[PDB]
């Protein structure tokens, strides 16, 4: 129902798609090759800038295949993409394995899931 | 409450329950004994298949106790269970301690939390606002 | 909009703030200087107690800065803070780096994000509906 405006800023940028009508999220594909050493983090670029309908955020979520088979995950999962973030989407990927992990161009390395936001007003009590 | 059709497919499978009335999530219990060595990751069957009412997902979340005391967590936390997934629920547990971690039949190793979903419609743009 | 009642229970405690009107979460600030050894976890106190309006939970999420530059994250991210919890907000911070990581009084170490709750009722059956 909700709307996300999207700008490609890299030749390899892809418009994320839902696999099925029941998918919670959409696959995010790398636009560049990144080597990630054992026991370290890399920043993987997605080559897209998003504008989300007010009232919504994006969660950037670890893919389970990569987690189970290479101990690779989104280190800040669920990574927060704020409604007012307009820069490039990038995934912080950790390699918790003893083996190197190559992110090739096109690789699905995270998922984007749209969620509604709810802003809190704080009311201080000496209670 | 929204509804979840559940089928047990292991004798040891358990209908998940909210510990309190105020709980966000329901507890997921292992059916198989699994050992998870240091700095590695194992897969824990729960022996259930879910069908969630339409327009909802289930996030599989790390229990805070296990994380704090044993450095164990759901590696894909929050693990996405899509509305239309009908296969067995399983939890990818990682072990970041320099020690063995043992999963025993009936051990609660994660939390399922239910959430509404929202579908984006992408609109391509030369330039944003 | 929803209401959170907050009680400070530590002198260094800060009422969390949203950086902007578009922010998903408010920053959680430590009240104690603590050192977290490499490849270990630490329970970091925020020195605040929360009453969330009925129907909302809180998520405690890793800050992206600390993850990328220090391999520091919230080990149970997203940390479930249930609606009926009136204790001290504490953050389970892991240091996955091979370096000591110092938390200082006032440091932003996680983000709390209000989400709305949904309880399931389980109906058991013999066979489920099919999909693709």
From Swiss-Prot, chain A:
SUPFAM superfamilies for this protein: dUTPase-like
Pathway: Pyrimidine metabolism; dUMP biosynthesis; dUMP from dCTP (dUTP route): step 2/2
EC number: 3.6.1.23
Binding site for substrate: 63-65, 76, 80-82, 90
Catalytic activity: dUTP + H2O = dUMP + diphosphate + H(+)
Keyword Magnesium belongs to the record: yes
Annotated keywords: Hydrolase, Magnesium, Metal-binding, Nucleotide metabolism
Family assignment from sequence similarity: Belongs to the dUTPase family.
PANTHER family xrefs: DEOXYURIDINE 5'-TRIPHOSPHATE NUCLEOTIDOHYDROLASE
Protein name: Deoxyuridine 5'-triphosphate nucleotidohydrolase
Species in which this protein is naturally found: Helicobacter pylori (strain ATCC 700392 / 26695)
């Amino acid at each position: 129902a909700m709307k996300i405006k999207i700008q490609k800023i890299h030749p390899n940028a892809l418009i994320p798609k839902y696999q099925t009508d029941g998918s919670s999220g959409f696959d995010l594909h790398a636009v560049e090759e990144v080597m990630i050493k054992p026991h370290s983090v890399g920043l993987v670029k997605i080559g897209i800038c998003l504008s989300l309908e007010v009232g919504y955020e994006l969660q950037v979520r670890t893919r389970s295949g990569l987690a189970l088979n290479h101990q690779v995950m989104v280190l800040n999962s669920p990574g927060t993409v704020d409604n007012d973030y307009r820069g490039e989407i990038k995934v912080i990927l950790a390699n918790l394995s003893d083996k190197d992990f190559k992110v090739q161009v096109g690789d699905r390395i995270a998922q984007g899931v749209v969620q509604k936001t709810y802003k809190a007003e704080f009311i201080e009590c000496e209670q």
